[PDB]
């Protein structure tokens, strides 16, 4: 619903002849998806990595603490892939990452 | 390219043409090592460790029995060239371990 409202505001901005960047602000969200998070860790953009303790197959995350240690990324193993899914509006998330937050946080 | 002699036999035989130099075909880049593939293979080697036959060959190379190590690696892998390449790979691993220690 929030995305629909944002797209409606951007459509009105285009209709009145303004850029969508003039009406929308840069977003700050929790990064998720295993391939996306691994790419962020390899590019050293992630500030914090949280890895679910119950990933089956375990090979999807068995290299990830060593990857974080090599890239100097703070990581933590946390209970609940469903618990991370509640963050990312999914049933299950194998891993989540924080890259940057707002100035008040 | 060396110009052909224009004869039917001998060294550098064949009809004379003006040979061209070719930009290398991208299909021939296979085997070239990439930075990401280096990083991923090094990380997987660090995570997983060695095979038992690799440990046996490393023990033989530490003990200095190079001929026995090559023979054992040939018996394990099947071919002389693969056995040889595995021998320099494990020697490099031993050298890295010694320079770390």
């Amino acid at each position: 619903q929030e995305k629909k409202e944002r797209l409606l505001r951007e459509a009105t901005a285009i209709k009145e002849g303004k850029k969508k960047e003039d009406v929308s602000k840069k977003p700050y969200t929790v990064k998720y998806g295993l391939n996306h998070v691994v790419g962020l860790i390899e590019n050293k953009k992630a500030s914090l990595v949280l890895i679910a303790n119950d990933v089956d197959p375990i090979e999807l995350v068995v290299f990830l603490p060593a990857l974080c240690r090599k890239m100097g990324i703070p990581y933590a193993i946390i209970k609940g892939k469903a618990r991370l899914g509640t963050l990312v509006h999914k049933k299950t998330a194998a891993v989540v990452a924080i890259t940057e937050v707002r100035s008040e946080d | 390219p060396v110009e052909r002699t224009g004869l039917i036999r001998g060294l550098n035989k064949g009809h004379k043409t003006t040979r061209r130099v070719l930009k290398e075909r991208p299909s021939r880049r296979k085997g070239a090592q990439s930075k990401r593939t280096q990083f991923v293979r090094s990380l997987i080697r660090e995570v997983a460790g060695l095979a038992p036959y690799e440990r046996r060959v490393i023990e033989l190379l530490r003990n200095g029995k190079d001929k026995r190590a090559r023979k054992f690696s040939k018996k394990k892998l099947g071919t002389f060239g693969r056995a040889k390449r595995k021998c320099e790979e494990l020697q490099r691993i031993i050298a890295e371990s010694r320079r770390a220690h």
Binding site: N43, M71 | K35, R36, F39
Partner: peptide, 8 residues
């Protein structure tokens, strides 16, 4: 850092 490709 390790990159898969150059990015825009």
């Amino acid at each position: 850092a390790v990159s898969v490709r150059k990015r825009a």
